[PDB]
Amino acid sequence: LYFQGSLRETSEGVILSVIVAPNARETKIVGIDGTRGRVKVNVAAPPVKGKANKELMKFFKKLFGAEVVIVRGETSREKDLLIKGITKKEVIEKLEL
Numbered sequence: 193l194y195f196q197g198s199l200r201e202t203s204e205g206v207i208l209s210v211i212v213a214p215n216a217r218e219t220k221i222v223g224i225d226g227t228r229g230r231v232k233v234n235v236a237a238p239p240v241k242g243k244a245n246k247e248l249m250k251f252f253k254k255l256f257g258a259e260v261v262i263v264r265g266e267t268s269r270e271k272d273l274l275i276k277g278i279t280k281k282e283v284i285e286k287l288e289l
């Protein structure tokens with residue numbers, strides 16, 4: 193039940209709610225924010241020219257094997273990612289790897 197506070201399944205796929213920190217040593221999940229209901233994601237890219245957004249999407253597209261788009265928070269640390277055409281059960285399985 194750990195990652196479930198950060199995700200919900202709509203007709204389109206899964207909205208994965210994250211909070212990023214850019215300029216990290218490695219793009220990876222580092223935790224969960226229990227109050228905000230978001231996965232803490234470090235992103236190994238600078239927050240300029242959209243590069244942290246691009247790296248974030250790339251990481252999750254690779255993890256889930258599905259298209260990932262930003263649906264809210266393009267210019268925020270708090271970003272909502274639509275994982276297209278996937279189920280919550282799939283997403284949880286992959287986040288728990």
Ligand code: NA
Pocket residue numbers: 238239240241242243244245246
């Ligand atoms: Na960015």
